[model samples]
Target: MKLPYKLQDVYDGESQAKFTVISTFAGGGGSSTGYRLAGAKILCINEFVEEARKTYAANYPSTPIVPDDIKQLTGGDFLKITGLKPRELDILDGSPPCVENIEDLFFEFIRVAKGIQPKVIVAENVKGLTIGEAKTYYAKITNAFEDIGYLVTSKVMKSSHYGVGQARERLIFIAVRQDIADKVGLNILTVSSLFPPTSSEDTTIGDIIGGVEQDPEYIQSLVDHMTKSGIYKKVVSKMPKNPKKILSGMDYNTKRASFYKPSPTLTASGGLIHWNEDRVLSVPELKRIQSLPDDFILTGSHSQQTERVGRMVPPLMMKAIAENIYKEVLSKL
Candidate 1:
């Protein structure tokens, strides 16, 4: 585990090291922007959601956007489409969704990567993957990659630590091929140092969500919810109503998100309301949570877009990772 390079010294611009990436489970082609921002050429993108497919296609038209599920596609299908040979691809990027015990989801990632045998595979998912009884799933998934010859490293990343204004935490796995890791003198295939270091100054909510106004209709819905009741003395008059109740059994908190403080982890359900004002977060403000650009167009109905955005890996965080990978790890090869 000898450390050869200064992990924190990633340069701020394009590098001479060649980088080609293919994104699977790409939503609206937004997360791919991180690789691109780090100066890589995106070969293709695959997504199962049709609306997301349309948006990704519309946004990155030249980069073949495959509107299909990963289970249906094979690694050879990837080579055939990209006109690249085995091991020619530099990176395989994916951000899998958090769903029911689908069982097929994470293992499918291994199948494709094993067949392709790319230099590396990068993935991110919900923070729940490595905690408590759920730790078994993380063990299962990582073992699958290692058994197939990948040297995998995973860590839970916090969004606020990387400049995103949201308090979201995510899990990231960056697996380098054994050959590549060996050549780079990497005894441990970890992205831990790739995380942007944190300091005392935290990003405040007003910095991102200021000047954005709330919709009147949305404002109208919260008029009755303005009352405050302590946990013990519940308000009998209050009728519990929220969209999250339909999709999830967990009771998400409803509170006034503070202007002085960063937001709570935004869910597919929705963000919180204003403390002084009477409205929930707007779409642009929500996008700011995941570090997506304000101009970034998320494809889908309002609800769908919000959910997808909420679940995504923060673009800025990914950029920090990809850039460091190129400048420090991949460049040596």
Candidate 2:
């Protein structure tokens, strides 16, 4: 088993090393889908989200999805699941399944990555990973990989930079793409200026979440979520946090509803209020924000689907990184 991978070994659904990235803390296959678009298949996935198995299975079809409490699962455990040898693994991909996994699960990726000694590892978390104690933990995680012969680096990235109409940001750590640790492009923060980022000209909330509709149930859910949010019942100008008196009907939870601008980060709730007075966003809207194709076929009721969208990485961002790396680096090699 070695540390790097040859480009030819990655997959087009091929049973090869480079083509298949092992995913830990997988959530509804968002990262896997993106890596797929970028030209790799998400081979095996470990998830902590209880709502994920069926959905990930329904959508990914071929990828294996594992349940959470994964912390207890050891390196041999994962290898047993996949029948893979440690050092031979390509990229080890880690992402905190959805918005709700309160654990700093990156440790699990390191545990397995160390055991497997993946050529590359990409782990993602909220920006909190860089703030206080989390920073040190991040350092420890990266150091673990470096000790295993990886060129590790970590950064905070913006999803909006990858052509997905949302300004979501996240914490990411990786070693570029080791021989072929086979980087999964975690949060895809800097595929910058190409479409000039997700905010490229003429790309708007109108475009992403367009064809707005007034689904009755979604409206009630919006009203209920807004009520719980405890904002005023009305809409006001100036970013909602400004010094303006919010009226009695507008209770936007996000910072902006500007169709002309990129959207606010979508939460695990997967709820995005469109332009002014717009009802809750439709599935099509949700798909665009996450860059899921119209036919992507999520597995859930409307609300469940949205949760999948909000909680997972927008595939487009990852795709951008995948395309970028494949063209600028891997393919060139």
Candidate 3:
């Protein structure tokens, strides 16, 4: 079946096409992979955590990575270290650390953009950014880009529609230089184009999970822990007796069934649950849900890998955004 977007067109006949990109606050290179799929070259990446850095380096060996806190590194530091000139870069993409006050994180991105002045800037964040007071923060961020002579646009997008096995929502903010935005005209901001239609069932957890033989280590760990702790048994007992009954009764599916739809989001904190069925998502399963290729290697412990992938911008979702940005935003440039 044909995919929703023409991915081949992005790189079709081009031989050695390259576009420089700088990824900041990168977690396992999800955004980087998405940009690469869109036919852009990743030049440098900056990530703070040791585990995340290891995963990033393992997957993107060609890209240089700077391991340091975002707050400690100035835009000049990035440019000087990466040897990237203002016009040399086609895109600046990252999701700043979102744990702090939302206002601070939003403005921090704007500050980096003003300092580096890349052709295009893409910021990804949780869907919560579109709600209530966070909306005010979002407006301020876009306004900051506009103040720096950019035409900014924002949208809330879902990953499932774009081929991710699990459903996940993210808010993407795209800012284009005034000249590029004008060339594209107001059409760039239209909803139909910004939120392109996608397939209803390109992927599922079963498609991602069934083939792999269950790891004995993982299964043993689950069996041991659950057997020792009555708590695990209690939780499973509380779960609906039948997966089908639970699927039909609940507004959202929370069961293991081929017919059941996946949950709305997968998180980094899966370790909190009981053992047995309470085990966290495996690294390969996380990659599959994020629409990454089966061969993609995530190097880290179970917890470390989960944390990194859980925090990532899903690759499929990024591909959709990158495609839209190219057609509605970059083509104008």
Candidate 4:
């Protein structure tokens, strides 16, 4: 109702786990938190960034993680940490960057999947993967997973459709092992049954942004930066006063957010401006929009924290996904 469950209220530790997950590119444990919310045990995690690793460890104190480059890590390495036999893992989760410099890294995830032979592989990528030049590449990516003995399907899911307050969309690829799908009579490549249904109700920034205290130091610094850049008046003039109408885009380009609508997709570059306040959205407020708990410990500079929040997959969106997988796929096995 209010926001969803806080991190503390819902996370009851590993004993109550319904399934198992090992996450890669596990930045700040966003998807890991989601699986936990859906009652899954996170056996291990992999993150390449040191700052993100510190933040993740702070939040997930007990989970084991590999801090080296994914290229150097092997399936045997994961098995040793997780203590699971090959093919025993319920899910292998990854969210590799899908475009530009590191797009090829998606194959690394595939390589690990080949070695571990997990029953299901869930990969999250930017929605751009299905559009324009990347469309062919997207097909090839799915084909690679299918080649690994999986029935693969992918769809774009909007965060707002779940419980997240931002209008962010992601392309989620779910690949069930051929045997698992055959056993469950779910051999079709369509992802319609794998994904959860969206809510009938709509949400806006105003619905969740209230009551949290803003951090003055952060807000003041942002205000000063905007003022120094001579964009404060422009931002103020362009933005609507309503909390639902929030402003997105760069200093030259502008948008609005108000009490009546969801915020535009946030960026690590600090493109969003608060509707009523002169500064940008606070860190805690961003946490709410991202469906992360208020107490989720994020380490590093303000900009680093902001970058982490902007880049994370909303936990609630992934929670619905993990829950549906448990119901429609894993339960029969």
The top-ranked prediction according to lDDT is: 4
Please give, for residues 1-333, the per-residue lDDT of candidate 4 as tens digits: 247456684476344788999999999888888889888899989999999999999988888989989899888889888899999999999998643674367888899899899999999866354447588888888889989999988888888888677888778899999989888888674456898888625567766666665667767887777656656675555545664345454533455556567777866665566776666677887888888877788899878988888888888888888989999999999
Task: Mark the regions of model 4 whose C-alpha exceeds 4 Å error after superposition.
Answer: 1-4, 13-15, 98-103, 127-132, 189-191, 215-221, 233-237, 243-255
TM agreement with the true structure for every prediction: 0.79, 0.72, 0.80, 0.90
Q: Model 1 shows how many backbone clashes?
A: 0
- The superposed Cα distance between candidate 3 and the true structure at residue 266, in angstroms, equals 1.8
- Between prediction 2 and prediction 4, which has the larger TM-score? 4
lDDT of 3: 0.63
Candidate 1: TM-score? 0.79
Candidate 4 lDDT trough over 10 residues, lowest sum: 244-253
* Best-matching candidate per TM-score: 4
lDDT of 4 at 84: 90
Stretches of candidate 3 off by over 4 Å are: 1-16, 99-103, 127-132, 186-192, 201-203, 207-210, 213-217, 241-259, 271-278, 331-333
lDDT of 1 by residue, 1-333 (tens): 011111121122223235989998898655676676677778888888887877666555667877767889898889888999988899899887764654556677778888788898888855344346578778877888899887888887776666666666677788888888778776653445544456325555655555454566765554444344342124222323332211111233554466666667777787465434434556766766566655566777767877767667766667777877886677887
State candidate 3's TM-score.
0.80
Report the candidate with higher TM-score, 1 versus 2: 1
